[PDB]
Amino acid sequence: RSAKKGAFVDAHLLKKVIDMNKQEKKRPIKTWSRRSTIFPEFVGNTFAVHNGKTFINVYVTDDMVGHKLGEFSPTRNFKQHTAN
Amino acid sequence: QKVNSNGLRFGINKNWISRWTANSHAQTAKWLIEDEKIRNLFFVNYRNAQVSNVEIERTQATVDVFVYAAQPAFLIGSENKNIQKITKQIKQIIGRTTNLDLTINEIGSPMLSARIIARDLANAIEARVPLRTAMRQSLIKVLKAGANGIKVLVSGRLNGAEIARDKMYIEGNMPLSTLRADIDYALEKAQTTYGVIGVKVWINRGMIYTKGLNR
Amino acid sequence: QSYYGLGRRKSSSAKVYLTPTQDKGKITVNRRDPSEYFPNKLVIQDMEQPLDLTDLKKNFDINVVVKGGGFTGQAGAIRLGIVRALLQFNPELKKILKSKKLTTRDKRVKERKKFGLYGARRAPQFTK
Amino acid sequence: AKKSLKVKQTRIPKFAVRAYTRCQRCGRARAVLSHFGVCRLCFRELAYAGAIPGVKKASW
Amino acid sequence: LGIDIPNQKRIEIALTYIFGIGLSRSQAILKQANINPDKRVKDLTEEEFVAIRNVASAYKIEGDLRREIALNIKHLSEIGAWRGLRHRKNLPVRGQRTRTNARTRKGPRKTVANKKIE
Amino acid sequence: RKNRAPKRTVLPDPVFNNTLVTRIINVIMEDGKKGLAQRILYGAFDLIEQRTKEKPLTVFERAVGNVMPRLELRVRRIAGSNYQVPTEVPQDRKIALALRWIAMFARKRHEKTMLEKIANEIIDASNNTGAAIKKKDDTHKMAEANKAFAHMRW
Amino acid sequence: VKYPELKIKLESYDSTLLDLTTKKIVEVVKGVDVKIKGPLPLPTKKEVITIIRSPHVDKASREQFEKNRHKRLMILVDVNQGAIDSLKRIKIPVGVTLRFS
RNA sequence: GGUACACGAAAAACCUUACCUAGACUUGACAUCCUUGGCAAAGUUAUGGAAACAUAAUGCCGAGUGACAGGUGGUGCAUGGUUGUCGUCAGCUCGUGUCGUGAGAUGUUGGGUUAAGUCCCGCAACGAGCGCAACCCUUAUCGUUAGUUACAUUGUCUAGCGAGACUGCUAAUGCAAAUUGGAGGAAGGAAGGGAUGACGUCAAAUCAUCAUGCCCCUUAUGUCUAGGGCUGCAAACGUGCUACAAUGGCCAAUACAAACAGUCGCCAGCUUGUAAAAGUGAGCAAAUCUGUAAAGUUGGUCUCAGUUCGGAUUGAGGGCUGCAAUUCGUCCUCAUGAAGUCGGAAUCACUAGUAAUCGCGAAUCAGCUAUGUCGCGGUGAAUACGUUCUCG
């Protein structure tokens, strides 16, 4: 899903979301690729997204549907408000 | 200072050896790579016979190679023992189906090039002999058997950790300013146990009559 | 009759046929009015200053064909053609036109911008 | 690990998401042409050798 | 609309400084009212003013647009998001370096002591 | 060590036959082009025309001529200080600074159109009221403490 | 007829080779072929490629290499059987590139 | 510090990546001692999975194994190659030779005199080499080449080439260099630009372009895939840039190009369109056809300010390709209308097409907020008092 097209997903990170969906969903799945847009199923879901070494969990909900899994996860690190 | 005169005088002084013309720029690099490998096979094969130039003239499936051998006995020998091997080995890199055409061409003053002169200078530097006499003989030979001014230099080290007795040898017509000098220049990155040693040679291949054209 | 002038200026090239006649002078470029073809400036009055520097514009119907450039480069090219046609007709007038470099090609074109340089010789500020 | 760089250069990524090019000899894939697949240093060095027929010095 | 209405000045463009009504929507209001761009006149039509509060008042209140944008920003910044993080840091969101830029959020580039190579 | 060198100045305009207005066009052009400055300058000659009934030639000459210096305070330094010795200022630089000062003052008093302000400054320099005459005034009045510097050469 | 219109472009970086090829086309067809257009030098498509010089950082002397593409346009509207019988003695030089058009 | 900084980097959605790790690789993807032949590891369809790596077959050729392959693994006073600073500085050396016991001067020095060590005059020097200059290429006239996909106001468009200017001429004429006089002229007197910057200098930069010596690592310094940074931010410096407006802002018509790119691409045309785009569709393998020439011009407008300046950031919706667009691309629309109302130390490019404008096509690019680069063209500055201070 982009600003240029409708809701479209690569369907390999949603793949396991759905595979667990037919089996009484539990949210966390080891996915840090940034190729899946969201759907009304990603509500409550969290994914361990790689920053540079660790895979931080990121909460997903049904607020807006105009982004991908990469936008819904902090891809970088900030200054930590440091004056050094 | 003194921007490298290698590319500064191709086209106006030096000649271009390997001509290739393909179609739209998809496999032009492939033509370049194949030509350079096939032509450098000779250059890496012989270092005592010192084969100088092999022009692979390619244009739209019209490939013409021409070897300029200094010693026919080293490139042919009895029963053509050498060339058939080339006729085999290049056949593996140029293609089995394509024809392999080449002939040993005669040329005067075969040391108007720089690569082989640099190789000989390195051999004299590391020939296990009084070195100064060796380079005096080598320079006398290059100046004697037919040639214009020479410009030979060696940089790096003295087989130690410092080059203190480097000798800059300039003879005859070495104008870097003149755009008709017909000077061919080459560099050699010699491998030894003291790091890479740079042996560089400028050589004037004959004063052409005020020509800016690739002759 | 058939006077044949050629001119070049600022990547503009032009020929002109000039013939003696008692019209307004056929003021036109590519056989069309310079209303919006050229900017309305002093350059539109300088358009016939070769005719002002020579026999009046009431002669030599300007049949000018042009290629490339702009308007001032165009104007310089076509006026160089005009002065060369005048040369083809009466070259005593060639003297004053050459005195300001009209018959001779003025050979003033934008200097080529160079590598790294911002323009012909523009360079960025750098002290330390 | 320059050979990793080179063997990833000879291989092509499975998508057009992933894509680059680099010289057969040089590393530092930055500033590489698509007309020869040769990096800027290797290209300049072979051009000072007159590899490409017609590489001249500009004098306008 | 009624906001940023100039006196003895073209009504056509002064609306662009309003929050929520730019050039295109300003022109939409103007041509829907057919105000016929003026010669430095506050308003060409006097009767259509009532037509304003008949049709132009029916236009969406930009005060509500402000709070809609505010709540959308709240949702975007509160959830885990790189653009949400950029919102949280009060800096360019779509991705711009703050090494020298960002002379709208960090003030007029307050020059501080340099902590750099030694 | 640059020595005496010529200058390239465009020849006088056919419609007025004054080289000074041409150097004005040379030095006023916005974005470095005459494709747009000449229109407004000819407008300005028109604006001078219906305002105070001043023909451009005489008003422009009486405006430019009254802002022109005669003293060159040639620099001579000590490597820790500096002083000025009064020689005769070159005539080419005389007219150059005259025209430059006229042009650069001509374009001020930011208002509705630049035609009114440029005609206003032309008129002001015409009437010798202080807007550019101050340049000529200072170029001689501040050369009074520097007039003492004419008693010795260093 | 072999070609209803022979719009053969021959081009290379070497003008002397282009001159040679276009002349050989000229006099070999001169007498056995008509409606030809002789040697026509077209405007060049020359360009320059600009690269850095130092191994590591430098942008003060950007080295440059020039590639010049000439263009000779030969327009032989008609090609005849006798034309080819007399023209079987033309070949493609190592620099000059001919168009089959 | 400059000789480090719109860098190496002519474009980062993960690779590029040299950094990190997760899944994973164990003489490794590659490379081969060895060993044998007989026909194939591909790619595909499921799958744990983020994909590998584990899955099975499917489609002259393979196939395993130690040392090694390879190492962006380091070591720029260990290095070459390459590159910049003084320097496109006017000077730099040597053979022979004189003399100072000599370090060496020297020829080169120097007068006029030059772009140059340019000439001569004289010089313990005669000469040569290096550089520069000059040769050479480019803008510049006439003729010549062929004529279309130029044209067709037909040789307008072009470079292939020739005649072709060089104090040539004349006088002012200096023992010599060499200025100008006026005309012929394309060039008239280094015609203008580019051009090799000599030994050296930075014990220059370059181990990470590349080649690398020594050592090392190897069942890891080997490789596959997934993600992130190369656009963070207390931030500064740099860098152009953005304007600080009424020649300007907006609206409308608006001419003149060069230039390169382009074959499932330029993509015309055509329609929906503010527009991205959506669909639609030739010619062009590119003098065919396509990717506007604009500023300027022509009229209205705003009538002095954070403004009809500037559009900053921002949110929402559409959009391009990329398997999927978010970062680690971008386009458009709508909405946002900040600062700056000309800014100190510092200052950089400059003798004309110069400084500045305006746009265009492309290089890398399936993407490019590279405001950057190659270019290209259009418009188009004064100035040079003298080096005062400094640099060299």
Curated annotation (Swiss-Prot), chain A:
Name of the coding gene: rpsS
Keyword tags: Ribonucleoprotein, Ribosomal protein, RNA-binding, rRNA-binding
Name of the protein: Small ribosomal subunit protein uS19
InterPro entries reported in the protein's UniProt record: Ribosomal_uS19 (IPR002222), Ribosomal_uS19_bac-type (IPR005732), Ribosomal_uS19_CS (IPR020934), Ribosomal_uS19_SF (IPR023575)
Domain of life (superkingdom): Bacteria
Purpose of the protein: Protein S19 forms a complex with S13 that binds strongly to the 16S ribosomal RNA.
Gene Ontology CC entries for this record: cytoplasm; small ribosomal subunit
Gene Ontology biological process: ribosomal small subunit assembly; translation
Pfam families for the chain: Ribosomal_S19
Family: Belongs to the universal ribosomal protein uS19 family.
MF terms in GO: rRNA binding; structural constituent of ribosome
From Swiss-Prot, chain E:
The organism's place on the tree of life at top rank: Bacteria
Alphabetical keyword list: Ribonucleoprotein, Ribosomal protein, RNA-binding, rRNA-binding, tRNA-binding
GTP-binding recorded as keyword: no
A GO molecular-function descriptor: rRNA binding
SUPFAM superfamilies, A to Z: S13-like H2TH domain
InterPro entries named among the record's database cross-references: Rbsml_uS13_C (IPR027437), Ribosomal_uS13 (IPR001892), Ribosomal_uS13-like_H2TH (IPR010979), Ribosomal_uS13_bac-type (IPR019980), Ribosomal_uS13_CS (IPR018269)
Biased composition (Basic residues): 90-113
One Pfam family, short name: Ribosomal_S13
Disordered as annotated region, ranges: 90-118
GO biological process: one example: translation
GO cellular component term of the entry, any: small ribosomal subunit
Function recorded in the entry: Located at the top of the head of the 30S subunit, it contacts several helices of the 16S rRNA. In the 70S ribosome it contacts the 23S rRNA (bridge B1a) and protein L5 of the 50S subunit (bridge B1b), connecting the 2 subunits; these bridges are implicated in subunit movement. Contacts the tRNAs in the A and P-sites.
UniProt subunit comment: Part of the 30S ribosomal subunit. Forms a loose heterodimer with protein S19. Forms two bridges to the 50S subunit in the 70S ribosome.
Similarity comment: Belongs to the universal ribosomal protein uS13 family.
Name of this chain's protein: Small ribosomal subunit protein uS13
Species in which this protein is naturally found: Mycoplasma pneumoniae (strain ATCC 29342 / M129 / Subtype 1)
From Swiss-Prot, chain F:
InterPro entries: Ribosomal_uS7, Ribosomal_uS7_bac/org-type, Ribosomal_uS7_CS, Ribosomal_uS7_dom, Ribosomal_uS7_dom_sf
Pfam families: Ribosomal_S7
CDD domains the record matches: uS7_Bacteria
Extent of the signal sequence: none
PROSITE patterns recorded: RIBOSOMAL_S7
Cellular component GO terms, alphabetical: small ribosomal subunit
Molecular function as annotated in GO: rRNA binding; structural constituent of ribosome; tRNA binding
Chain coiled-coil ranges: none
Keywords per UniProt: Ribonucleoprotein, Ribosomal protein, RNA-binding, rRNA-binding, tRNA-binding
A biological-process GO annotation: translation
Stated family: Belongs to the universal ribosomal protein uS7 family.
Assembly, per entry: Part of the 30S ribosomal subunit. Contacts proteins S9 and S11.
NCBIfam families, per database record: rpsG_bact
Task of the protein: One of the primary rRNA binding proteins, it binds directly to 16S rRNA where it nucleates assembly of the head domain of the 30S subunit. Is located at the subunit interface close to the decoding center, probably blocks exit of the E-site tRNA.
Protein name from the UniProt record: Small ribosomal subunit protein uS7
Organism: Mycoplasma pneumoniae (strain ATCC 29342 / M129 / Subtype 1)
Organismal lineage: Bacteria, Bacillati, Mycoplasmatota, Mycoplasmoidales, Mycoplasmoidaceae
Gene (UniProt): rpsG
Swiss-Prot record, chain G:
GO biological process terms, semicolon-separated: translation
InterPro entries in alphabetical order: Ribosomal_uS10, Ribosomal_uS10_CS, Ribosomal_uS10_dom, Ribosomal_uS10_dom_sf
NCBIfam families: PRK00596.1 (NF001861), rpsJ_bact (TIGR01049)
UniProt-recorded name of the protein: Small ribosomal subunit protein uS10
Cell membrane as UniProt keyword: no
Keywords: Ribonucleoprotein, Ribosomal protein
Subunit annotation: Part of the 30S ribosomal subunit.
Recorded superkingdom: Bacteria
